[PDB]
Symmetry: D2
Subunit: 210 residues, 4 copies
């Protein structure tokens, strides 16, 4: 198992590992070792009726590189395991296209440039404070929320479906939607029957059926 | 699949596993030399950094008496699917005579064993007569004894499994679940030998796994 | 508040943290009570429930004391997002289904005789238990002969969001009748303590059948 | 009611509490229906043997105002409930370390100058934030330039067992100093409301140094 999807300017979602497949839910539901029409029908049956515990026996590990404002939202998802890096310094700079629909009173390129400029100033201050003898944990508090971080995320398919309901949705901020779309893409590749049944029966958001 | 027999008719069988010792190293490093990797495992265990071990996950298939399952299912940080009937066999745990020896008893331990057998057969007979009379299964089943075997799948990460071993692979736990915990330990050790050894050395709070190999 | 359930069971409220307004204060992140406005606060509860913002309800918490048969407790304890403490001084009482429990089904003996047969095997299993305990068998070994209808007791501490999940699944005709009866009591106490949350739960979020038909 | 100021603008305040020491005792005994010495002895017994489940039946709600870098560490504690500040209005304040914060480390510029440089960035970053917002950039996008020392507020509902785990990890000299200060206040409130449980915790179970 290995997939990697680039997100934003420097981000990514990378698949590290997966335990199981669609049939792992079928086996869990039946408490059996079965290894097709009947099995798809059971997955659909479980999804329609909200019998989601069998999907907890499918597990993914992802490696995610995302800005802190994104990771902070993501880490609100309690039913999962996280290890975050505690070092490189890179920042998410929104592209000009990101800023359209909004009739900004300055050109979107200049908004991009203003963001780049303040990020550069904060980063230079951070580096000065460090070279001055300030400990990193203190100096780092000037750094902006668009600083990239990386983490490992281990999550089961049920909790992943919850994650997608909330984040693969127009009510979510655009940046996390882009991460959710990549998470969805990998889920679909690894668990096509579960994913399709999720979309058909259980998915509460808008963007995945668009 | 590794399958270890426990009690008279029980077992623990490994269904699947995600990762191995290196899964905790990669998670600690957040990064996708064998002695350096082993050193990190010991370091994490020694200094109480337990979260990397959540990235190693097991699924077991367990057949156990209900009184054992009831204790086991108290472990909340795990996923369970138990046999019900709408997606059964009827066997019962009968303790061996050796199970009961030591406790000063008034009758012989083999008679205690037969007295348990006798009451199990009477209760199962009543269950069958109720069923064949039209009583629905999940009402008739309430007369069956707590030593009735059940089966379940259990998906559990290594951190939670280690908590489970602390509590159940220990002489304060009832002897029956101790036996199941010993089997869970054997499998954990086989798949994650570096984690297991570090766990014994630095974090394990129980008594039995320091003395009983595997 | 204590409500009798089945022949010897009960649900008893031990404690409660908060009320409907606890969810409102958590949603707003404000412990400012000098601007209370009932209409506004009740509208927020509805809005949260309507749009699936469930986390504010986690700041209302209950503790119950429940006496139920083991086969009921086994189902109930599958609800992981909660805290349990079960009895391990002990009493020995068993749930014997009433004749009316066992009609609706076409039994080939009278429902009366089913009750008698269940009572009789319970008595026999209990006598055997006692015989083994007098003989020197440790109590935790002798008890394995006791039937699944043996009563147990537990404390259950659970937040309102998890409680609503419990009601979705257990206050429902797909649940076994015995745990339905317990869920109806749990619902009654929830409604008494958090009436606005309960009402909005039924209107917008509740997935089961029974609570929409059966008052309280 | 109980409020403790933390850092330059932060706080921990107690919103509510369910139960007290006797809630763990009732839970352990499974008994709703006095003997002080016996009840203290049970609490000590549970703590020293690691029978921690009874302490799950004591629950707290706190209202906390903390910089984001502190809140990021705190929210890693999963066995709890959080609501962070659309429903309520937003203010913009930032944690500026005091010069004494930098005492011990031998810096190449005076500590007051470090304070000053941190204030400079806050001002410039916040001024850029406002420029971007006045220009039609959405707040959720403009705010990405703001530093990690921006204050946020949240409600935290947590049981006493989970609170003890939090204190083990955060009331400790290995935790960053700022979250230590918050943990100290959490511990104080816990001590006030559950003195027997807290005392037993220090005696037998607490793994940190600072408490
Ligand atoms: C020897 C022995 C005797 C026992 N006697 C009794 C008895 O008399 N009565 C009885 O009811 N039970 C009894 N138990 C069961 C025991 O109280 C626990 O329910 C069981 O051991 C599971 O432990 P756990 O909570 O650590 O595991 P899990 O429930 O898997 O939790 C793992 C860890 O996650 C954390 N956690 C998970 N959920 C919560 C939460 N809601 N709040 C705070 N932290 C949480 C804790 O840190 C916990 O250690 C006994 C267990 C043992 C081993
Ligand atoms: C009518 C009916 C028939 C049933 N038949 C069976 C059966 O045949 N076999 C059987 O084993 N069980 C059966 N159950 C039990 C069922 O599978 C659940 O264990 C039980 O209802 C608890 O529900 P829950 O997981 O939503 O609740 P909780 O365990 O309290 O969890 C609450 C919520 O937290 C989330 N959650 C908690 N832990 C995890 C986790 N580890 N991973 C992902 N998400 C998590 C989920 O969103 C869940 O809704 C049955 C239940 C009902 C109501
Ligand atoms: C000094 C210090 C340095 C740190 N450095 C880093 C770092 O570099 N990177 C980093 O990512 N984090 C770091 N952390 C965060 C740390 O790894 C934990 O996320 C945090 O301390 C919360 O601990 P917890 O999991 O015990 O608490 P909770 O998340 O509240 O869990 C409570 C208890 O429940 C159990 N539990 C809950 N969920 C699960 C689960 N899914 N699986 C198994 N068991 C579970 C565990 O027994 C746990 O003890 C650091 C913390 C400290 C104190
Ligand atoms: C569009 C949008 C706007 C948001 N705005 C805000 C905001 O303003 N403030 C804010 O704080 N957060 C906000 N959030 C975050 C939101 O409150 C949740 O924290 C986040 O969506 C995680 O959802 P969850 O609890 O279902 O996931 P998890 O935390 O993984 O929980 C998974 C499931 O387990 C169950 N569960 C887990 N733990 C508990 C528990 N302790 N009690 C009861 N059930 C539990 C629930 O059934 C839950 O669905 C927002 C999210 C979205 C998508
Ligand atoms: O869309 C949202 C809005 C808020 N939050 C949570 C994450 C933070 O804990 C807090 C504030 O997030 P921001 O609105 O600052 O992104 O609420 C989300 O998870 N998603
Ligand atoms: O060693 C024990 C003793 C008790 N319990 C829990 C399981 C049940 O929820 C309840 C009663 O268990 P018995 O003592 O009746 O097995 O307490 C355990 O998990 N382990
Ligand atoms: O309605 C049900 C059916 C099953 N189970 C869970 C409880 C047990 O863990 C297992 C089997 O329960 P019974 O069907 O045998 O009650 O599945 C429930 O929780 N509720
Ligand atoms: O003392 C620490 C160090 C790290 N982390 C977690 C929180 C973040 O998710 C991530 C990085 O935190 P910082 O070291 O960057 O604060 O690791 C903590 O909780 N406490």
């Amino acid at each position: 198992h290995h997939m990697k999807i680039d997100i934003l300017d420097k981000g990514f979602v990378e698949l590290v590992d997966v335990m199981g497949n669609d049939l792992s839910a079928v086996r869990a539901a039946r408490v059996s070792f079965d290894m097709e029409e009947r099995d798809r029908h059971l997955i659909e049956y479980l999804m329609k009726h909200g019998h989601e515990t069998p999907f907890e026996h499918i597990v993914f590990t992802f490696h995610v590189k995302a800005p802190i404002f994104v990771a902070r939202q993501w880490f609100r998802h309690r039913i999962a395991s996280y290890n975050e890096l505690s070092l490189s310094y890179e920042f998410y700079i929104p592209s000009p296209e990101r800023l359209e629909g909004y009739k900004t009173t300055i050109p979107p390129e200049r908004v991009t440039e203003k963001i780049s400029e303040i990020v550069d100033k904060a980063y230079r201050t951070y580096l000065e404070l460090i070279e001055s003898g300030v400990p990193r944990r203190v100096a780092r508090i000037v750094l902006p929320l668009n600083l990239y971080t990386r983490f490992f995320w281990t999550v089961n398919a049920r909790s992943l479906m919850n994650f997608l309901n909330l984040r693969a949705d127009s009510h979510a901020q655009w940046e996390i939607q882009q991460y959710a779309l990549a998470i969805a893409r990998i889920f679909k590749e690894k668990c096509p029957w579960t994913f399709e049944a999720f979309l058909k029966y259980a998915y509460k958001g808008d963007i995945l059926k668009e």
